[PDB]
Design a protein around this nucleic acid. Sequence first.
RNA 1: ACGAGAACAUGCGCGACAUUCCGAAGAACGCUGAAGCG
Length: 296
Amino acid sequence: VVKLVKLTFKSPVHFGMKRLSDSNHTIAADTLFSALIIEALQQQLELSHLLNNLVITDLFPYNKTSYFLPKPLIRIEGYKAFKKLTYIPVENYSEYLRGEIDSLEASKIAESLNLGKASLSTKVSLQAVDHNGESEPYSVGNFTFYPESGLYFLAKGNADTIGQLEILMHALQYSGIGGKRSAGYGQFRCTIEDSGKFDSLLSQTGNIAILLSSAMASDEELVDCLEDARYLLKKRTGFVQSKTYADQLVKKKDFYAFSAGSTFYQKFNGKIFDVSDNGRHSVYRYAKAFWLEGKI
RNA sequence: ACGAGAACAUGCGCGACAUUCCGAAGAACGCUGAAGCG
């Protein structure tokens, strides 16, 4: 049951990737899945159903005109335009797979992206000033979406799983996503509806397969899938965000996952991984795979 | 169990000091209290 979820962000969002200064326009599926898990914990909702039966897609840009998917990692027989071309409208993406997209149209598609503007807020901490100290400045990354634009993701699951996702997203609207939430950022409104277009892209048969979410297979699946693939291996690191985990905040175990949009000739099922070390509760990372079939 | 959790772009700071709306300039030029004589 593929459901399109569209997030329109009222206030700017941080969506940090490596620091507080930098801001990402989107987030990977692991971040959204962690937010869903946190929300289910707050709402006293079971985690097993969400962990097992739910496979979600990375968040991707969309405008009033087009919904943008990640550029597939396929061989190109100029190249700077394709490097600049990160997202392709779904109708254009099938043409890109067919290889009809030239460099000029690639640059035109890349400039067509009007997701929003990335800024940097400069803030201070005045806590030391009271205790005979000096204030200290810092910076928070931000990304403000244009009024028509927003982010979206596709989620597949059982009917009960979809309803639980609806409730969790209704709560996440006010909980927020990204960094420096509960400090002025990350507030969004969500709308979940079935999308015929996405279902048409979902149902497809091709020689090649492309990830829609950041994922990594188990070793047994890795042996078969790794061969004949073009992928980007991205590191997923972070600090645990919980009160129950430890007395003081502890970093998560470093993970490495195939970036969304990577092309595998052999598909692999995803696995929910545990990046906890010596903690009171296991810290979950989402590495399940959302697949699109294409022909090159 | 969102490169995350706290974290005020903030504190002290007078739009202020020096300045004459003055300088030059005749209310004066011409002008019969007078004409006819009933």
